Symmetry: C7
Subunit: 198 residues, 7 copies
């Protein structure tokens, strides 16, 4: 064993408690409330447009406002899952016990929970990257529309990128709603083994 100073140890123990209280309130209060808010956004008219010709913008020059406005609403939700998933993962990580030869089935559930939260955080970060990739790809296609006015397929590439972003951003909002419901159910179904592994 290595000796640890008591005054710092008491401050570390208060951090471990605060992380425990937040992770439990996030799983049992925030994850359920956030699922209801994200479900309500998907029932709004902006995210349910049948003719995708409506979302098209005339074009080099301007950026799609109908997409810029939806992205501005989606980006705050992706940032909240990444932050809240990190607090929940740390809580499960600090409940994993001393490595021992037997009674390691509960530890596997705790290790499976930490691996799911790492997948959710990585998928959420990819969604933020896809929004940046849309702006760079539309920006390049706009430069090519001006450089080669004769080719009509350059213009069709901008309309295709805009329509695919509308489908992709609506799918990201459905996936964020699905991740909050899936993580709440799994953590609550497997709570006794996650809280008390052995």
């Amino acid at each position: 064993l290595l000796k640890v100073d008591q005054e710092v140890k008491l401050k570390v123990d208060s951090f471990r408690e605060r992380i425990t209280s937040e992770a439990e309130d996030l799983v049992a209060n925030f994850f359920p409330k956030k699922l209801l808010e994200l479900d309500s956004f998907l029932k709004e008219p902006i995210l349910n447009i049948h003719d995708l010709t409506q979302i098209h913008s005339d074009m080099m020059l301007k950026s799609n406002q109908q997409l810029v406005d939806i992205i501005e609403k989606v980006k705050p939700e992706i940032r909240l899952l990444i932050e809240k998933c990190n607090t929940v993962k740390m809580w499960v990580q600090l409940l994993i016990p001393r490595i021992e030869d037997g009674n390691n089935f509960g530890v596997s559930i705790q290790e499976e929970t930490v691996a799911e939260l790492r997948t959710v955080e990585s998928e959420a970060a990819s969604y933020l990257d896809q929004i940046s990739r849309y702006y760079i790809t539309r920006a390049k296609l706009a430069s090519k529309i001006a450089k080669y006015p004769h080719v009509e397929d350059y213009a069709r590439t901008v309309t295709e990128i805009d329509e695919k972003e509308y489908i992709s951003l609506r799918l990201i909002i459905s996936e964020l709603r699905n991740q909050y419901v899936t993580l709440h159910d799994m953590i609550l179904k497997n709570i006794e083994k996650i809280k008390r592994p052995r």
Copy 2:
């Protein structure tokens, strides 16, 4: 266990019921009706042209309107599988039980069902990317036909891309019809274990 507020819990239970009702009607009613519509599209003349020299457009400048018209009908069908597959996957996920050492054969069927729905949803998204890649590739080749008028293989590259897109778009419509029938049969054959795993 972590305590959950009852009023928000009652709202979460209504979401879980709505997702169950929709997923059951999509597998039982929509998936079979969509298979009949996609099979009817494949017997229409626009998708059954023996001489692919009739799909050719003279060319920089214009974009094939025989292909732009088919892509316009294919893209709405690809978007419906991605959205409907996501609702059915969530229904199976919310049925997966507390992790336990034994009686996990039914859980495997529920986990195999979610893995197939993820493969179907990823393949459908790839089909939408392929339509965008056609427009960028034809656009680049159209720019080269103008830059190098002398090379006659630049023109043959545009005729080849148009013929490969026609064969590819008909294969996407047949694959989308195959995914609706294959997913209906598997979910209906394996329903008792998916609904009641243990």
Copy 3:
């Protein structure tokens, strides 16, 4: 179980029978007739040229018309295998039974058959891509022959690409004939287990 409307169910059952009837005739009557036609093409003089200096075109400018003429014959055959393999794969997929703990040896033969048909369909689609890559690569090499008239190796690169495409297109016709005979023998040597898995 989920209830299914009877009138649509009768229509789904009629589709399942048509896919069964077509798939049985393709394995039994079309795969054997197509092997005999593809074998006869390989004995025609155009696909059996010993001196490969006779398939050479003088060159920027023109595209080989000895190669363009063979590609025009090879491309329709690659398209027929992709469409017919898709109908046979679906017939086998609709015969795979409810997942159960035992008696899964026949299911493995049905799953192994679907995996072979997926490999044949992917290899056939790759062959269509190889023909498009020939045109883009020859087109670029032709642009370089005009940009750098001094380098003698740019011209040798065009003669090499034309000779390799002749060897490659003849290998594709042999591989397509081999896939028809191989799929016919495996499907009718393993029919009893594929039709009746358990």
Copy 4:
């Protein structure tokens, strides 16, 4: 055995003791104090800005100074984990015993600890690379904003990169804090087998 000079052996033993002393203080005193400092930074206002439009710089030309100031604070903390993790890994490596057929469960804990410390050191080095990629990518986008003033998406690409860097730097400060608490708990829980494997 190979004979080793005693005077150099005495000096190697003092190095081996100094590394043991430092690693034990780093795990029991520094790792806990650093978690407390990194948690306090996350509660400071600079890292808690709700409207991410307040971190936007007007733009070619100038670099974000709200981001340059945070990177100047984040980069020293990443450098301390990489150096301190290397001292702790060497201590665990020098406790691994002579390879023997049995009683190798504790050696697995020591080998698992060295693998976690190698993962922490690699992840920390990646975070330093991500800060360099932000500057090169913003520099390139700034050059394109000057080259193509007409395209409005080039400007949106810079605001998007600045907002993603703010979210990423707050995540690096949280991950660095999480690595100090995770490594302190694992090494202290598993100390008896890490110090005395057999």
Copy 5:
């Protein structure tokens, strides 16, 4: 079972007999004679030049005649192995029996034989690609010797590529000779199980 037309079946059986006769004569007569011809080429002076400075061409402009002449002899031999290996692979493939739970050791030898022939046919096709890559790389290096006359290393890159091609082409003639002897020995040693698997 599926019924097959007798007249088309009789023609399919004649094809299977012709493939069997050719594959048996290729393994027993052609593979041994080809190994003797390829061994005789390797003892000729053209492929046994000690001073590799003698195979150098002065250079943009001219391509190496000494190497163009050897590639002209090597390329026909690579084409014969690819075509003849395809006939031998099909004969072994048409001998693989109905899938059964036991007595599957001979089937493994037949499957190992088809996998080796697929490796030989793929390695041979790569050798044809390597010859095309030499011409494109020498062409690019020749364009750079003219663009940057001052840099002496551009000239040394052409002499190095020519010497490496001489070594590579002699290794390809030895590998083609080694594939003929290796495939003859394995197929004759393992014939009883390949011809009669069970």
Copy 6:
């Protein structure tokens, strides 16, 4: 067995004895002396600069002298480990016995030791590549600072590369010291089985 000429055998035996003597002195006397020298360099002021803004050079034009001076000291130490690790690997490789069915636990230690030395020798060679990548990356960024004088992120990219190189070169010196102590401990602990495997 194959007969070997005695006079050449006696000379081969003298080589194997000389390699054995060197490998034993290198593990017993040089690995320990080199670890003390590399540890002393890490306590020197040049490798321990807290303000990393003191290692910054004004900038196209000049290269960082503070970094050039350290790379000149680091590169000789990386070269000595690569050369000495090769003599120690050959000594262990030439002690591996005739392949036999049993008593292969000691051979595994000898095979595991040769694999660690291959990892050290490959990692050390990578460090020499990283020093070359610094010069090419700083050189490209310096070309861009002159081409695009307006963008201030190009200048921040050079200061960042210089700071990451200082952190990296101090990490290479600590890793080289750690490899000498780790290799000496493992080879000396596992000596009886490495020298006499069975």
Copy 7:
């Protein structure tokens, strides 16, 4: 079995005997003599220069003669290992017996010997590619030194590539010597099972 013509069979048997005699003389006379010649080269002054600033050439324009002179000696030695390893691999391949269910331990030693010789022959071919990459990389860096005279790091990149090539060429000469001694010991230690597997 397939009948084989006796006269061609007698000629194949003489080829098989010639490969056996050559392979046994290479393992027992050439491999030992080549290890001694390559060890003597490593003790010559040209490959043992302490100050690597003495191998530097002033520079666009000239190529390093001190390196062109060492590469001219190293390249003939890499070529001999590739050709001689191919003769030894074929001898071991032609001794591998008919596949049988049991008594397959010796076949594993013969299969391990063919795999080692394939790794040695692939590594040697890569060393020849590395000599070509030095020339193309030095040539490109020399072109950039003339294009951007202001950037001093372009010049430091040529001095670094030259010093790394000197270290790499001495490492290739030691690796070629190590491969001759390692292959002689493994083949002579494991000869009885390689010559008579069962």
